[PDB]
Design a protein around this ligand. Sequence first.
Ligand SMILES: OC[C@H]1O[C@@H](O)[C@H](O)[C@@H](O)[C@@H]1O
Ligand SMILES: OC[C@H]1O[C@@H](O)[C@H](O)[C@@H](O)[C@@H]1O
Ligand SMILES: OC[C@H]1O[C@@H](O)[C@H](O)[C@@H](O)[C@@H]1O
Length: 628
Amino acid sequence: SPNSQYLKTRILDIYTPEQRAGIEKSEDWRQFSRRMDTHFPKLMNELDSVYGNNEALLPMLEMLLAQAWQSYSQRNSSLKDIDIARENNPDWILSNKQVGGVCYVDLFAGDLKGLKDKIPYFQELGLTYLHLMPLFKCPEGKSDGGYAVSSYRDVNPALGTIGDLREVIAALHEAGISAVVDFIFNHTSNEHEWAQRCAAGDPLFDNFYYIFPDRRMPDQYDRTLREIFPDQHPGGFSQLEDGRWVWTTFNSFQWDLNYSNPWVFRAMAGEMLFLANLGVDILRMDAVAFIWKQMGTSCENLPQAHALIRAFNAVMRIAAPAVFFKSEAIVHPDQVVQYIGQDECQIGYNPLQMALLWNTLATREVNLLHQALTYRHNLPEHTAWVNYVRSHDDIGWTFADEDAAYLGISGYDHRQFLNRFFVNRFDGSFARGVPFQYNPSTGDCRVSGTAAALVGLAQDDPHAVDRIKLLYSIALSTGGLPLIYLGDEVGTLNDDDWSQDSNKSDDSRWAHRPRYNEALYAQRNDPSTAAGQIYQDLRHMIAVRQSNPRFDGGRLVTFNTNNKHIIGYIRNNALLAFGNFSEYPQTVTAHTLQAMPFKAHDLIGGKTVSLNQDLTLQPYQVMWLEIA
Ligand SMILES: OC[C@H]1O[C@@H](O)[C@H](O)[C@@H](O)[C@@H]1O
Ligand SMILES: OC[C@H]1O[C@@H](O)[C@H](O)[C@@H](O)[C@@H]1O
Ligand SMILES: OC[C@H]1O[C@@H](O)[C@H](O)[C@@H](O)[C@@H]1O
């Protein structure tokens, strides 16, 4: 395999002798050259592990490196300053100062111009990170909410223009907010130029997707494939009008890209560089688990998938150091953590904590949550979790059956209960969610519904507001970057139009993708309303988190509370957090608290608490005690 020095001499061959001499002495070339020497070894090693002696690897690599240099040369000076800043501050993602929010531009603010006008609010809330849902062109009508991309560079006209997007990004940076967008790299819409040309037989796009003549191979693959949207189609394939079959992990109009073709990697690396130069700070790597297929396997979390992501990482280390990755892997806990690393995805969603927060509200027992925080929370240096309560997606019960069995819990029976409970098919449940993708062949099912709907705010459950406060307190204090599903801070309920919308009726996730509720947002400063109670409560916690150094970093040590309903953990050996998941008062005994300081200030309620006696927490009460 080639070396950095040799490859760089070929990159410069596009220049005449006179021009070349000037490039060699330029600052941009010096920075690029240094990064190449440092990071190229990883790029080469990762690409070699995937493609091996493929005749197309070297040509593809040289084309990619040439593009990378051109991309870096074009990169704006301001962005280059951020590149250097983060190159020397790898833990910027682990700071307690960070708090993120996510929203759909159209649903939250109408269009990109309208979103820019909401920035003052984001600053008011304390956000330093903003994830904007799919912004580029997609099919009209059904597009999996923008996740079926028809173009990676042309902005959805309904939202605005590329010009508007640049203004929004610039405005976000001006307000001290990082711009986060999706990198939908596992598949494109069936209307994307690449898809059309591949299917049409254009040799330039040969093997850009996985297309078969009949069901022979698809049938073989289906023996081991998990169904993501069983309501849409069985297995992982859809049939074209001409009779052929195509790999479609998700909707039939979403065609999986073929990374076994090195030219597909190059193509996607090019799109990544485009996003990088728009000023994006973090790319949400969508459906990372599915980017490599292999007959006889689940075609999820395969070795080459991880290698390809690390190759993409190296490209950014060389051509846009400021760009970090956020892994979106909603899979088994053992597999989730494998995507997280300084050289792969620096941050990643923490579905286990999220799923268990809801599990605990249902069961009132913190056993599973305590187990996860004890054995699956701490991560390698320079990496962090993205902790959340809700997202634009359904809730999947992705806890480990092996972990549960150790606690004497049957994963299958337990999920049956959780599903019944959250869709209000269990006596006394306070949840008002709706099922998503019930699979009668496996019995699996997920839950749709907003955070407020799931805690009982729809029917005005007196404990709803407190449940919301408790869940968010944990995402905000365990260690990692907390992400607020915008709308949750004022208790937004489910959308009640989706069910009758023919373009949404078959995807219950729309139940929890409501529009900006003008009425609730206008009540955020009124302490007598649920909206104001939730807003001030969350805003207070955000304020404490960002101003108090005891929350810095992502490590934690659990504390045995000796009360099955109370979770407890310590941050930096200075902040003791207790969370009561029971709708009844619960106590931590004086005996349990003997090693703690006699007194400690509670940052939540603002009072001094005595720890030399029984400590009783009110229903769903949360305490953040300064013990150092
Ligand atoms: O595109 C398929 C899926 O990709 C995921 O990254 C998105 O979170 C989900 O909403 C979408 O359905
Ligand atoms: O509802 C009572 C019990 O039912 C079981 O099916 C659940 O797995 C358990 O968590 C719950 O406490
Ligand atoms: O010293 C405080 C510790 O004492 C131990 O012997 C108790 O089992 C434990 O619950 C308490 O936290």
